[PDB]
């Protein structure tokens, strides 16, 4: 039914860490870490490290952006940062060890992969979420057609919501679930971009991919 | 040099096995610094605070039905599972002891007072070692270091006999251990 | 009447920011996960040829542990741990014999927190080549054990000693050894 980021997810366990509130590192925080890598010889790998920390952040928020409707997403998001925090422990005591900085980078990747697995696992165990997430794609695809010749002036970010209320504002799921209605509101901005000839859409998110894929 | 206060958090999951895996008991405990606060005893079926500081945790976890069922099944999915994984090189691990006998002086002034029976590099730690003076078992004058675990999956122990070996006598150190069907022996002619 | 015990023990210590994930069987270490490299290391190579473990899982656990340590420290109103000095002892692997390869074992027992500096000395000179050590092993009283090793060639002209430094000690503890 719904495509997972990992087809056959390996068992995942929750540590009940969804209620943490400040897992994400601030810039000053990250900078104070980058600063430890003060030696010359390590300045090249320090770039690859900063680049990975960024890819990391984008990855994490990417998950909440696509799956905020899935209860277990806070668990996955928070775990990612709790793990990052451990890697940073090593980074702080190995600030100029290029081989270590490279291992850490490799681990930051592994942490992301694990996140995708675990996410796929929790999704597989929540058939209901799947039905809802698929239905959201279903209607966004219909909306892709429905708005074929209409005027979409989304400049003030007001029309999108109206259109969703106009075409599906009576759908039980669009009234009751904010996340579901949002996937559709998010969808019309995508459709708009599609019409303007945007070609990267499918790479924008799992949702965008599921929507604009055939 | 470092005079800063430290704070320690430990978590231990103990699997206790009896008669193979007939009876298993899981003990999950949380330790702050040097004091257990909360724990899950499979014999109980749910979290119980051990100190005041544990209460919040015992209360919170216990309200998670999914979590409790897991822990309750852990005895099988975790304990018995892991027990199998390593059985061949742990429970079955057998390393024959190396027995040798050499004299020694109880004091720098004393004569060749005691004989030492060195039993080393064996595993499991369960072993038996007895002294015999001309076929007759000796007990009254034995002293030992007790069983010693080396930390590399092997044990060693020293068993001494406090007797000035008179000429003519043949002392014998007999070692019995799982790694060998017939007891090991080392004689020492007076 | 219990026959065996398999213990999964992990810890996180502040402000050092040092953690440990290990499996224990009847007192001996089966393996542990090197936190820095995030990978399983077995106590005996042989073990790896028959079993495995996802180091990534340990990372997850130590990640949560860290967060818990903060929560507990605060909830306890920042109560620091009471240093308990180690009991050091040194003996050989097997009976010593001139020029016959042997090993020196330094047993550091009953202590906490899990932080300790160990140094091997031969006639006053710090020795290294050959040395090894086990990670921090857990005790039922919630204190720790640790072993350090020094392979050596016996000789009637060497005096070795294991130097152990721990916060619970007034001065560096220095246990001697020299065939005696």
């Amino acid at each position: 039914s719904m495509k997972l980021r990992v087809e056959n997810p390996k068992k995942a366990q929750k540590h009940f860490v969804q209620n943490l509130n400040n897992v994400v590192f601030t810039n000053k925080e990250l900078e104070d870490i980058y600063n430890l890598s003060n030696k010359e010889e390590t300045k090249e790998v320090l770039k690859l490290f900063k680049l990975k920390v960024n890819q990391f952040y984008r990855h994490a928020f990417g998950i909440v952006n696509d799956y905020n409707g899935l209860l277990e997403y806070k668990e996955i998001f928070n775990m990612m940062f709790l793990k990052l925090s451990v890697v940073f422990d090593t980074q702080r005591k190995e600030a100029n060890n290029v081989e270590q900085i490279k291992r850490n980078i490799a681990i930051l990747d592994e942490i992301m992969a694990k996140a995708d697995n675990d996410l796929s696992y929790f999704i597989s165990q929540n058939k209901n979420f799947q039905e809802l997430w698929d239905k959201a794609v279903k209607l966004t695809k219909e909306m892709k057609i429905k708005l074929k010749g209409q005027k979409l002036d989304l400049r003030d970010g007001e029309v999108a919501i109206n259109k969703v209320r106009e075409l599906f504002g009576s759908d039980k799921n669009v009234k009751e679930l904010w996340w579901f209605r949002s996937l559709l509101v998010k969808g019309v901005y995508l459709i708009k971009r599609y019409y303007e000839g945007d070609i990267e859409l499918k790479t924008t998110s799992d949702f965008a991919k599921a929507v604009f894929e055939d | 040099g470092d005079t800063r206060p430290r704070f320690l958090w430990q978590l231990k999951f103990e699997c206790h096995f009896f008669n193979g895996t007939e009876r298993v008991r899981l003990l999950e405990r949380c330790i702050y610094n040097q004091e257990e606060s909360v724990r899950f005893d499979s014999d109980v079926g749910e979290y119980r605070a051990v100190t005041e500081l544990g209460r919040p945790d015992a209360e919170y976890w216990n309200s998670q039905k999914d979590l409790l069922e897991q822990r309750r099944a852990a005895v099988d999915t975790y304990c018995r599972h892991n027990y199998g994984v390593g059985e061949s090189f742990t429970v079955q691990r057998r390393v024959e002891p190396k027995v040798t006998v050499y004299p020694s002086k109880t004091q720098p002034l004393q004569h060749h007072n005691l004989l030492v029976c060195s039993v080393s590099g064996f595993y499991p730690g369960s072993i038996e070692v007895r002294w015999f003076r001309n076929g007759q078992e000796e007990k009254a004058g034995v002293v030992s270091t007790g069983l010693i675990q080396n930390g590399d999956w092997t044990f060693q122990t020293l068993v001494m006999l406090e007797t000035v070996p008179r000429s003519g006598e043949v002392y014998t150190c007999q070692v019995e251990h799982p790694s060998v069907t017939s007891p090991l022996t080392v004689e020492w002619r007076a | 009447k219990e026959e065996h015990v398999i213990i999964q023990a992990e810890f996180y210590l502040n402000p050092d920011q040092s953690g440990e994930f290990m499996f224990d069987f009847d007192g001996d270490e089966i393996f542990h996960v090197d936190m820095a490299k995030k990978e399983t290391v077995w106590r005996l190579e042989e073990f790896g040829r028959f079993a495995s473990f996802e180091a990534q899982g340990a990372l997850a656990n130590i990640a949560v542990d860290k967060a818990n340590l903060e929560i507990m420290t605060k909830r306890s109103n920042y109560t620091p741990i009471t240093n308990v000095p180690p009991e050091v002892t040194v003996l050989t692997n097997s009976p010593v014999e001139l020029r016959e390869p042997n090993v020196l074992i330094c047993f550091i027992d009953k202590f906490t927190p899990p932080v300790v500096n160990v140094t091997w000395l031969r006639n006053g000179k710090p020795v290294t080549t050959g040395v090894s050590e086990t990670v921090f092993l857990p005790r039922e009283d919630h204190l720790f054990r640790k072993f350090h090793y020094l392979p050596f060639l016996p000789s009637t002209e060497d005096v070795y000693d294991c130097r152990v430094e721990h916060w619970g000690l007034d001065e560096p503890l220095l246990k001697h050894w020299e065939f005696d």
């Binding site: 540590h15 009940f16 | 978590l11 209360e59 975790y78 | 656990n61 909830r75």
Partner: peptide, 13 residues
Amino acid sequence: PKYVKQNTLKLAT
């Protein structure tokens, strides 16, 4: 054979 672990749970709040 794969050694399996027990997940750590986050403390109260």
